[PDB]
């Protein structure tokens with residue numbers, strides 16, 4: 001009943017879809033075994049790489065496939081195209097920079113090969129190693145120029161450091177050079193923040209992911225990244241990591257802090273936070289197959305700035321696709337949401 | 349002709365009852381300063397109270413003055429914004445950070461008596477919520493009873509964590525037993541995050557009301573829901589401000605991922621609940637719009653929670669803005685719903 005081909009009036013383009021490489025998962029296992037994994041890696045990957053639960057075992061199998069099985073799963077849910085990225089946390093936590101760069105290179109080449117096999121079904125976002133910003137700049141260019149990628153995904157913090165530090169500037173410089181978006185995908189919080197969430201079972205997708213990622217996007221807005229780089233587009237999933245809902249409070253309290261000189265890293269910005277959401281931030285509904293939240297975000301940010309995403313294989317649910325197809329939205333809005341926003345912002 | 353007038357007395361068709369309004373006592377602020385000076389203050393106290401107690405900014409200095417008044421200046425400020433009644437609580441973090449239990453109990457007792465005196469003096473304007481010292485849950489239970497029976501209070505406000513500990517721990521159970529005995533709501537108000545969580549927010553200027561408050565408080569409410577507090581205590585009502593600390597917006601993801609975790613037996617701590625998280629929002633959680641004078645968010649939350657479960661709050665004096673009251677008065681919302689929002693929901697849930 002869910003079919004590819006666009007007969008219902010739009011293609012379904014899923015914009016936050018994950019894969020893994022066996023060798024990178026094996027590094028996570030090595031780090032867990034040797035005690036160099038952070039608490040988030042132990043929690044997240046200690047569970048999915050080892051748990052006998054149905055959910056974990058199917059996730060791992062699906063993550064690792066970039067071929068016929070993935071295509072069959074897409075076909076079964078009417079998903080025409082998937083924008084693919086190496087699953088969080090990528091190579092960001094790795095302590096050996098040579099290893100991180102080598103494995104990122106291999107993951108990027110593996111993804112490029114899969115997109116070359118299925119160029120009408122798979123679209124790639126590159127993975128990088130922000131612990132080396134200039135290498136990451138090189139890899140942004142290589143992905144854009146040689147591999148056919150449409151941007152990059154960064155899995156939030158790198159070893160507890162955030163992208164608003166000047167150190168990471170080459171990444172943004174390069175994204176603006178190639179004119180591609182950055183998708184800031186969640187990760188577990190760093191060890192500096194995770195403990196109260198971890199103890200309650202809240203460190204992952206239920207809560208901690210949104211804390212980490214919303215914080216990361218907010219700190220980039222408030223350091224002025226979009227004044228420095230006015231063309232830059234940053235995408236986030238999960239209905240904007242709560243920021244659209246918080247918007248009134250974000251702007252009120254941001255302004256209060258700026259005027260009162262409360263913080264060194266909070267100085268005047270050229271736009272309000274609302275202004276940046278309307279011009280520089282893009283959101284997907286990954287994990288949020290929920291009409292009132294989607295409509296809220298369309299209203300606040302503009303319906304051109306909200307895109308469909310499935311979050312395969314972490315949230316692979318045929319009934320969610322059906323619920324999205326059935327929303328009380330005009331045909332014209334629905335086609336933007338499922339297809340034409342992604343075509344614009346990813347330059348498909 | 350639109351007016352700038354904001355009048356007490358209910359002539360718009362409702363009283364304006366503000367449900368998250370703060371005051372301070374000088375002696376408790378002086379303890380914060382002492383803790384900052386002697387190095388026993390946590391990073392959040394240094395950030396928050398180093399700012400309000402010492403900043404020369406216009407905003408901080410006016411806030412500190414207003415916090416300390418429980419009399420004619422506060423009443424005039426309410427009159428000037430058409431606020432008929434204020435539900436008052438000792439400002440975060442209260443006595444929760446204090447290491448000396450005797451000092452915490454003594455200062456909380458004094459703050460509660462000071463509040464009760466003010467409510468007795470202005471009984472049609474001021475309504476009290478008690479402050480407690482969760483470091484001593486059994487004393488706190490006695491103080492919940494004293495507030496309800498002797499002081500005329502309508503519930504208690506707890507300023508989220510106590511020294512890095514959360515209310516889902518069994519240690520704090522006496523507080524819940526007492527709330528159910530007096531049948532009163534708990535307002536979980538924000539605080540700065542504990543030292544175990546604050547660092548990345550603090551460095552960016554995000555530890556306070558802009559962001560970290562919502563992280564801390566939403567986490568705390570979520571922890572309580574997922575430990576099963578409302579299965580243990582089905583009558584218990586927990587109130588939160590700031591449009592539900594994002595939880596209403598996250599609801600689909602909360603329930604989906606809560607279920608995923610329980611079904612995969614991922615966390616020994618996270619076990620089956622009798623209701624969905626959505627179910628608990630509709631039966632056991634209540635929300636105010638403190639800091640969120642914003643129609644789309646209010647309406648969203650009214651749809652998720654039910655219009656009977658969302659109340660007006662000003663967050664005086666941290667967010668004292670006449671234009672916000674005007675915007676709220678003029679929302680495209682039925683008279684009946686608007687009256688619930690401003691007046692009758694609070695009258696029900698606080699038993700006014």
Ligand SMILES: COc1cc(C(=O)O)cc([N+](=O)[O-])c1O
Nearest residue numbers: 018087088186204205287311314
């Ligand atoms: C490791 O990558 C993910 C993990 C989960 C999960 O543990 O359920 C969800 C998402 N997500 O974006 O929500 C992920 O991409």
Ligand SMILES: COc1cc(C(=O)O)cc([N+](=O)[O-])c1O
Nearest residue numbers: 370439440538556557639663666
């Ligand atoms: C110390 O108590 C508060 C502080 C602030 C602030 O720093 O602006 C905001 C709220 N509030 O609830 O948002 C307070 O109650």
Ligand SMILES: [Cl-]
Nearest residue numbers: 470471472473
């Ligand atoms: Cl009176």
Ligand SMILES: [Cl-]
Nearest residue numbers: 512542543544
């Ligand atoms: Cl701590």
Ligand SMILES: [Cl-]
Nearest residue numbers: 581582583584
């Ligand atoms: Cl009960």
Ligand SMILES: [Cl-]
Nearest residue numbers: 053054055612
């Ligand atoms: Cl399972």
Ligand SMILES: [Mn+2]
Nearest residue numbers: 016018286311
């Ligand atoms: Mn994802």
Ligand SMILES: [Mn+2]
Nearest residue numbers: 368370638663
């Ligand atoms: Mn408040």
